[PDB]
Amino acid sequence: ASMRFTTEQIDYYGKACNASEDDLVVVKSYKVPSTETGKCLMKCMITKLGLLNDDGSYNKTGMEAGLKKYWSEWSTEKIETINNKCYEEALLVSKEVVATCNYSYTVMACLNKQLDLD
């Protein structure tokens, strides 16, 4: 189990963020675009899902709700376990760090790591 989005999810949320075609192709290949806004597509996407607040910080309640909505095959216990761990790490991260486009990938990595610990 990982946090990867499906092709279709990427297409839909990518287009909701007005992705350029070239960037979109890259994101669908699970790589990070090198363009100024392409590298921020993941941030834009997960923010529309409510996983992050608008300042970029981790949204605890919004992460829980989004996990339940989009990964409903995971039990609420498993959702809460990985949420509780990642949230606590996110309390250590300042305003200037959460503002970076890379922070979204750091959050997804935390989740993926907690998923592998099962």
Helix/strand number for the chain, H first, E second: 7, 0
Do residues 80 and 88 make contact, with C-beta atoms less than 8 angstroms apart? no
**DSSP secondary structure, 39-96, as one string:** GGHHHHHHHHHTSB-TTS-B-HHHHHHHHHHH-TTS-HHHHHHHHHHHHHHHTT--HH
Place of tokens 């990867």: 4
Cα dist. 41→15, 44, 53, 101 in Å?
Answer: 10, 5, 15, 8
Residue 11 CB-density burial (10 A; 0-12 exposed, 13-18 middle, 19+ buried): middle
| Rg value, the chain, Cα | 14
Measured CA to CA, the distance from residue 86 to residue 67 in angstroms comes to: 13
Q: Which two tokens stand for residue 56?
A: 């970029």
CA 49/CA 71 separation, integer angstroms? 13
Q: Which tokens in the block code for residue 71?
A: 């990964």
Q: In terms of Cα–Cα distance, which of 2, 63, 12 is closest to 41?
A: 12
Residue 4, both tokens? 């990867």
Q: How far apart are alpha carbons 77 and 32 in whole angstroms?
A: 31
DSSP 20: -
**Method by which this entry was solved:** X-ray
- C-alpha span between 47 and 107 (Å, rounded): 12
Contact 50, 62 (CB under 8 A): yes
Rounded distance between C-alpha atoms, residue 9 and residue 4, angstroms? 10
In angstroms, rounded to a whole number, what is the distance separating the alpha carbons of residues 99 and 63? 17
